Amino acid sequence: ELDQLRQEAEQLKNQIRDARKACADATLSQITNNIDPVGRIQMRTRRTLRGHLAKIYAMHWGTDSRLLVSASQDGKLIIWDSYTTNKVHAIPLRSSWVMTCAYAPSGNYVACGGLDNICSIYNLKTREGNVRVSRELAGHTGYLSCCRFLDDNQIVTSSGDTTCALWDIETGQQTTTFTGHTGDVMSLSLAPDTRLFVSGACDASAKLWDVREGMCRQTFTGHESDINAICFFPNGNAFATGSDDATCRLFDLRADQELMTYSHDNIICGITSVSFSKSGRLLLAGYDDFNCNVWDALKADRAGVLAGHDNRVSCLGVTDDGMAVATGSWDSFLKIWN
Amino acid sequence: RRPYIL
Amino acid sequence: QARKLVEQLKMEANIDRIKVSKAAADLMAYCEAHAKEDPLLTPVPASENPF
Amino acid sequence: VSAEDKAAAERSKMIDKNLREDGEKARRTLRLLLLGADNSGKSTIVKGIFETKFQVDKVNFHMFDVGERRKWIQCFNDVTAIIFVVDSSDYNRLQEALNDFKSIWNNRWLRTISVILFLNKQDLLAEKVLAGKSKIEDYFPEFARYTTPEATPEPGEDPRVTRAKYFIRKEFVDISTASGDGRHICYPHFTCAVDTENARRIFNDCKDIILQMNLREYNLV
Amino acid sequence: VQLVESGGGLVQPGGSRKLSCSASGFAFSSFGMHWVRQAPEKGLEWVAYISSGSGTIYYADTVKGRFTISRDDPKNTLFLQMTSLRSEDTAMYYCVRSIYYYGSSPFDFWGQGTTLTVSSDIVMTQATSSVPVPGESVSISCRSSKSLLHSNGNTYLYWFLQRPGQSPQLLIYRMSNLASGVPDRFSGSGSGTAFTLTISRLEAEDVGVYYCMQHLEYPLTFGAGTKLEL
Amino acid sequence: NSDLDVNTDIYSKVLVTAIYLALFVVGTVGNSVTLFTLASTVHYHLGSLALSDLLILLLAMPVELYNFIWVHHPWAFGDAGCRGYYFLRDACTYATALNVASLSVERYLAICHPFKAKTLMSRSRTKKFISAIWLASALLAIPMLFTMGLQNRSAGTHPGGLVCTPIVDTATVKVVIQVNTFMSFLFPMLVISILNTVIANKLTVMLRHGVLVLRAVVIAFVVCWLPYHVRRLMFCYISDEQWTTFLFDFYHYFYMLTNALFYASSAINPILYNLVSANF
Fold first, then answer.
1. Do E71 and E89 belong to one domain?
2. For chain A, what is the radius of gyration of the CA atoms?
3. C1-51 — its CATH code?
4. How far is Cα F25 from Cα E73, in angstroms, rounded to an integer?
5. Which residues 6+ apart lie within 8 Å of D193 measured at CB?
């Protein structure tokens, strides 16, 4: 009965395509045609964080908008005070092949992971005055690409084994497993209310999942290559993806289809990271061309360029209060832009 | 004579 | 194998959807409402800028 | 800058000192990436991620084995070399080996990384050629028109074995020279899973790689 | 975590003695260390400080030139060599660990001190020496001669409690932050040169002497100490 | 001032000025391009050498072109100017020589001992080495500061008879010039020659472009710095009796030729060190 199932799947795909087409009464460009342009945005490098002796792979801001954790290929996880450029902590790692890091919203823990297939959770605020490995979460059969905290006890990890996992830290067991991607899951983004989350993979596909039910609620397919970065809109109703297609795309969850495409003929390099500003008007995307572009999220016009890095911009993030943007690159330097 | 330039 | 994909497509097809224009208007309204509190759009004076 | 801020700055300076010491001690080891198939016999070349350390002439080598897309390959764009192991005795899977070698050679993050190619299991290749039960012509037609160029070890030399092994090497060397452009080189070697010179071969090839990099950097060649 | 003092005893004036502190249960090399002395019937007085790595060493003016503070990190030991001992050096000496980074809690642990018997500064003022109090709110006030609010937003004021027969323990750091292990009924509030520690629903085991200390500049100065009594 | 009149025929001053202007513009452009491109340890020494060559080209060329070829008399910068000019000239010369020798040493370590050079090389060590090179260059030029000065050598005292010249004993001028030659020419010559010979031998026994570059480096250093020091020794050693008219004129013509070659050295160094091998 394989052929009958294939025909039914094709019919369902056609039905979904027709449903998405029916809802497209007008485009975002015809609605924001009359909104005022942002203008030229010129952000300067306020502080340059030095101390990493290898490529920087990930950074994550703390919820206080002052402390940030960065991960480097030299086996180091460094916690910085951004205002004074003071190294608050330096954590050695058992594996130097790190691809992700996370900062708990409470600030008590940090997360790390990579080619060892293990999410290591380190406890910062402890007696004895030294950071210790609180937990090692194992169970993924591939490398860890991204990890995000929900609280001090729940963590969501994305892996290269095509799956995602919701772990209870105290028990150490996968409370939920998310399956459905046919390729390597590269990025993960938690919703502001922390009930849904989106994951982009190397299928040129992004999936919207429900944490409590464990099922895939939606699938978005607009890209032509691997989706390397994904980020939620501040209101939790839309999200942006960046691919190796040298293209970003803004998708809407309630319309269940793509809203906008950010692309330029002079851009032929992949997109490593994307992020939104506090109001959602700006979209900051990092590239392999050694710089970052600031797009007007409503008009698809490139509002500005941040061009201070001497190698591939591997990570970028925006503080919760929207004051500063941190970019980390392969030149072993983090930069703060305001 | 003698040159005076070194 | 194929049955799971068919079930997933059935669950994705049976979803309430809104117009694209309504979503665009919602995003515009959100951006306009919070435009005054975005430091990157509106630069902060050095007196209140921590960086 | 209060007293607590001064103490925090002193703590940061101590952290910087420790980081510098750790980086200096880490930058004394040559990192290598081991690649191959299940039949290759990669783990017998010398002596998540498996790491093997060895030392030749007071130089420390650290090899990493992970495990087709290889998205993680970007992590190894700064390694000294890639050690690619091929089972040259398997004529059925040799085209897969050639395709994998071509994929690794033309990777965009590996454009400046040389490859030390080990054509492994020469005992089995010799037995296959001398037995005559399997023929390379059944898989690579051009072997019918291939002549041995002029060069081979004497202790047990047989023209058929030499011709077969030189053809198998020439396939990979042609893949290498198609788009090498001089940025990186391929170093082909023949092994038998009983030799003890593989560490020496990697040592010599790494010395050659570093010599070429120094020639380019120091504005000599 | 444990800090054990040793040495002490009765000495003649003009002599010398070395006090020692053995550290256990924590990474001693990452902590700065303080020697703080208390006279037999008086308040706490800061004596000396040595930074992590022995980079910075500070001495109080009353002991500068006679006391030497040192540390042996491999042996996890802290030493105070006292020469030219005077009658005013008769006191109980405490060793205090103190780590400094963004969000740290300095002066968090104190050791049970050792007894020694011999035969420009910011002045911290505590309004009352005694106030009688089970189940009622108690407000302890403190003042400083100089504003403790730094330009970085921090108000460097600390509240300690010393129970009878015990070494003082940290209650509040930077005028509002509750120390780890301290019940939530303690609160701290105030502005520059005006500080208040509020104890809501006072219980037993909360009776002792309360000290306010400034960490804005050296030398570190304590208040006289407010005593609660039942 | 008839005893301080240097006889230099015309059609030679114009030619030497043209050569100096061409070398000046070419070397300035080349060193500026090299510095712009440079601005893990090779770049430090290349920049140091380019800086030294640009410094000697800009700082010492016009003062010499005025006071030493066109207007020999009287000195037009006073006593402070004479001492400062000679001190800075010697400092630049020493800096160039030591930068070239250090670059040869670094190349030898990189090529003949690549594995040890990988561990020894660090940014702090390179910065310390460059600082030591410059410190030695500054220190070795100090004796020349206390050797040169103004002196009246006219027929009495007349303003036109004041010249910038060694003002110490001849037996001491011989010592200072011998020290300058040994620590500016012969020691770097031996280091460069031996090390580049070893490197070229290693490269020939396997790239011939590198061997040609090394040979060009050695030959350029020789042919650009030997006549200068030969001329200085000729000035210092020859007795007063032998300095006839022919020798007197020959000294200043040889001065023009030697300074031309000496500045051609700094004109050619950026080409040989950065513009011959691919820089992109």
1. yes
2. 20
3. 4.10.260.10
4. 62
5. D41, D44, D120, D121, D123
Contact in structure between A200 and A206 (CB atoms under 8 Å): yes
Instruction: Give CA–CA dist F93/F185, Å, rounded.
Output: 10
Look up the CATH number of the domain holding residue A222: 2.130.10.10
Query: Tokens for D159?
Result: 């023209």
Contacts of F279 in chain D (CB under 8 A): 219
Contact present, A289 and A269 (Cβ < 8 Å): yes
Number of structural domains found in chain D: 1
Question: Which residue segment(s) compose the domain that E78 sits in?
Answer: 2-118
**E9 contacts A136 by C-beta, under 8 angstroms:** no
**What was the experiment behind these coordinates?**
cryo-EM
- Rounded Cα gap, residues D136 and D90, in angstroms: 10
E10 and E78 within one domain: yes
What is the rounded distance in angstroms from the CA atom of residue A149 to the CA atom of residue A103?
7
Q: Which chains have 3+ CB pairs within 8 A of D?
A: A, E, F
This structure's resolution (angstroms)?
2.6
Question: Cβ D14–E52 below 8 Å, yes or no?
Answer: yes
Angle of the D94-105 helix axis to the D159-178 helix axis, nearest 10: 30
Domain count, chain E: 2
Q: Which CATH number does the domain housing residue D165 bear?
A: 3.40.50.300
Q: Do E25 and A129 touch (CB under 8 A)?
A: no
Domain hosting residue F216, numbered range: 1-280
Residue in chain D closest to E105 (alpha carbons) equals D4
Amino acid at residue number D103? S
Report d(CA F226, CA E150) in Å as an integer. 67
E14 and E34 housed in the same domain: yes
Residue of E nearest to A132 (CA): E27
Are E111 and E167 in the same domain? Answer: no
CA distance A248 to F188: 59
Give long-range contacts, CB 8 A cutoff, 24+ apart: A87-93: A87/A51, A87/D11, A87/D12, A87/D15, A87/D16, A88/D8, A88/E101, A88/E102, A88/E103, A89/A124, A89/A131, A89/D15, A89/E101, A90/D15, A90/D18, A90/D19, A91/A122, A91/A131, A92/D22, A93/A120
Name chain F contacts of B4, Cβ cutoff 8 Å: 4, 153, 163, 165
Domain span including residue A294: 1-337
Displacement of CA F252 from its chain's centroid (Å): 18
Q: What are the backbone dihedrals phi and psi of residue C17, each rounded to the nearest 5 degrees, phi first?
A: -125, 150
Q: How many structural domains comprise chain F?
A: 1
Query: Where are the alpha helices (H) located in D57-158, listed in sequence order?
Result: 94-105, 122-131
Q: Do chains F and D touch (3 or more CB pairs under 8 A)?
A: yes
